């Protein structure tokens, strides 16, 4: 409610840190073999945007937990030497630094 524009801003800034759009939409098993056997709770920026515009986030805490879930799932599935794991680690750190007083 008082946080809706704040979260819209946080999402826009976090997506700017993923210019390639690798976190833009859900990862499917066709794109990533075995993904749904390893990752129990998928997340992506599109799903996060739908939750914002639906007023589904009750707090900044809840929003940060979905961002961290997204990045944690990428670091769990992908090997550390991959662009995907490296971006997830980098944007996790930077994003939380932005969103935390």
């Amino acid at each position: 409610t008082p946080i809706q524009q704040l979260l819209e801003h946080f999402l826009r800034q976090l997506q700017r840190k993923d210019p390639h759009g690798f976190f833009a939409f859900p990862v499917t098993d066709a794109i990533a073999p075995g993904y749904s056997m390893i990752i129990k709770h998928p997340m992506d920026f599109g799903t996060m945007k739908d939750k914002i515009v639906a007023n589904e986030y009750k707090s900044v805490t809840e929003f940060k937990a979905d961002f961290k879930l997204m990045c944690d799932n990428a670091m769990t599935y992908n090997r550390p030497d991959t662009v995907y794991y490296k971006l997830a680690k980098k944007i996790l750190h930077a994003g939380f630094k932005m969103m935390s007083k």
């Binding site: 390639h20 066709a30 794109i31 073999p33 075995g34 599935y77 992908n78 991959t82 662009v83 995907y84």
Partner: peptide
């Protein structure tokens, strides 16, 4: 086979 289909350079 544990990886993305593409290299993610584009």
């Amino acid at each position: 086979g544990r990886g993305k289909g593409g290299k993610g350079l584009g």
